[PDB]
Design a protein around this ligand. Structure first.
Ligand SMILES: Nc1nc2c(ncn2[C@@H]2O[C@@H]3COP(=O)(O)O[C@H]4[C@@H](O)[C@H](n5cnc6c(=O)[nH]c(N)nc65)O[C@@H]4COP(=O)(O)O[C@H]3[C@H]2O)c(=O)[nH]1
Ligand SMILES: Nc1nc2c(ncn2[C@@H]2O[C@@H]3COP(=O)(O)O[C@H]4[C@@H](O)[C@H](n5cnc6c(=O)[nH]c(N)nc65)O[C@@H]4COP(=O)(O)O[C@H]3[C@H]2O)c(=O)[nH]1
Length: 150
């Protein structure tokens, strides 16, 4: 597990997530893969130091975990990237999930009375439509996040 946030890492998101995809295949369920980029860590790190940036990451991680199911997967994909696997999702409920996830990551983190906030950008991929494996789905979600901010 990621030492800073305690969340599963990139390696673990795959080991876990690939099994969920195999389960969804058997159960005839859909799985939604969210790629979350957080903007604003460069400014926090440059101004206050990497340790304040790490406190922001830790609080944001805890907040997201508390707002998704314990059966869903939240991983620290990279430095300022998070990946979320939502098991047994449907298109009709997506808008509500995105609003909940965006509002949670957008909440300021009070670090010694300074109000530090990051800006989330989310890309979505859907299993089985967007791919057979988690590597494929993540690339689709990542590219969608990239193309929307252009
Ligand atoms: N994997 C995953 N799927 C999610 C998650 N959030 C919502 N869904 C999916 O979206 C459906 C509708 O969500 P809702 O509008 O919040 O509508 C929900 C909500 O109002 C309530 N609900 C169910 N569980 C919880 C919960 O643990 N906490 C809260 N506050 N409400 C819950 O019951 C309604 C119906 O729930 P469901 O039949 O299960 O139907 C849920 C479920 O299939 C999620 O965090 N992870
Ligand atoms: N709007 C909405 N939010 C959802 C949904 N599913 C999960 N969440 C969010 O994710 C948090 C953690 O879900 P959990 O791990 O299943 O942890 C849940 C779950 O174990 C249980 N719980 C609450 N409501 C339901 C429910 O309606 N059905 C079942 N089976 N369990 C529930 O209590 C724990 C804490 O619930 P919360 O405090 O509500 O905290 C929930 C809620 O903020 C949902 O379908 N709709």
């Amino acid at each position: 597990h990621d030492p800073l946030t305690g969340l599963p890492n990139r390696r673990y998101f795959f080991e876990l997530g690939n099994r969920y995809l195999d389960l969804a295949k058997r159960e005839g369920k859909k799985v939604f893969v969210l790629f979350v980029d957080l903007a604003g860590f460069k400014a926090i790190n440059d101004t206050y130091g990497h340790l304040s940036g790490d406190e922001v990451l830790k609080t944001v991680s805890k907040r997201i975990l508390d707002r998704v199911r314990r059966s869903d997967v939240v991983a620290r994909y990279g430095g300022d990237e998070f990946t979320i696997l939502l098991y047994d999702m449907k298109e009709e409920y997506l808008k509500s999930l995105l609003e909940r996830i965006l509002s949670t990551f957008r909440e300021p983190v009070r670090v010694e009375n300074k109000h530090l906030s990051v800006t989330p950008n989310i890309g979505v991929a859907r299993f089985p439509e967007d791919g057979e494996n988690l590597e494929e789905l993540l690339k689709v979600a990542d590219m969608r996040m990239y193309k929307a901010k252009e």
